[PDB]
Amino acid sequence: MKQLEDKIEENTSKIYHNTNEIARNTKLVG
Amino acid sequence: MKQLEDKIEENTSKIYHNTNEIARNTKLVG
Amino acid sequence: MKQLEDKIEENTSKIYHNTNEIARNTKLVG
């Protein structure tokens, strides 16, 4: 369970940062 | 298993939406 | 464990590719 939870959280964090950078680019292309 | 599967699916959904927004921005920057 | 690990890795790969495309768009909007 716990190492798998660690891997999922690493992906959750990568997704978080990507979502912010996508939003930044969305604003610039507007 | 099942709560972990729930978390993975939440990430799969976030990735799905991000992929669509990235494609949108890709088209605009072309 | 193993099928769940497979699903996590599929997400890790999708995130990898999205990160590269986001970087590409970031450079173009600069």
Curated annotation (Swiss-Prot), chains A, B, C:
Induction comment: Translation is induced by amino acid or purine starvation, or during growth in low or poor carbon sources. Translational repression during nutrient-rich conditions is dependent on four uORFs (upstream open reading frames) present in the 5'-UTR of the mRNA; these promote ribosome dissociation. Translational induction occurs in conditions reducing translation machinery efficiency, leading to ribosomes scanning over the uORFs, and increased translation of the mRNA. The rapid translational induction is followed by transcriptional induction at later time-points, independently of the uORF sequences.
Region (Leucine-zipper): 4-25
Places the protein is found: Nucleus
Highest taxon of source: Eukaryota
Disruption phenotype: Abolishes recruitment of the mediator complex to the upstream activating sequence (UAS) of amino-acid starvation responsive genes. Decreases RNA level of genes involved in amino acid biosynthesis and cofactor biosynthesis during amino acid starvation or methyl methanesulfonate stress. Growth dependent on amino acid supplementation. Sensitive to amino acid starvation. Sensitive to purine starvation. Decreases cellular glycogen levels during glucose starvation.
PTM field: Phosphorylated by the cyclin-CDK PCL5-PHO85.
Residues of the signal peptide: none
Main function: Master transcriptional regulator that mediates the response to amino acid starvation. Binds variations of the DNA sequence 5'-ATGA[CG]TCAT-3' in canonical nucleosome-depleted 5'-positioned promoters, and also within coding sequences and 3' non-coding regions. During nutrient starvation (low or poor amino acid, carbon or purine sources), it activates genes required for amino acid biosynthesis and transport, autophagy, cofactor biosynthesis and transport, mitochondrial transport, and additional downstream transcription factors.
The family this protein is said to belong to: Belongs to the bZIP family. GCN4 subfamily.
Assembly notes: Homodimer. Each subunit binds overlapping and non-identical half-sites that flank the central CG base-pair in the pseudo-palindromic motif 5'-ATGA[CG]TCAT-3'. Interacts with the mediator tail; the interaction with GAL11/MED15 is direct. Interacts with the SAGA histone acetyltransferase complex. Interacts with the SWI/SNF chromatin remodeling complex.
Description of its domains: Residues 89 to 100 and 106 to 125 define the N-terminal activation domain (NTAD) and the central acidic activation domain (CAAD) respectively, which can function independently to promote high-level transcription of the target genes.
Name of the featured protein: General control transcription factor GCN4
Organism: Saccharomyces cerevisiae (strain ATCC 204508 / S288c)
Residues of the full protein shown: 250 to 279 of 281
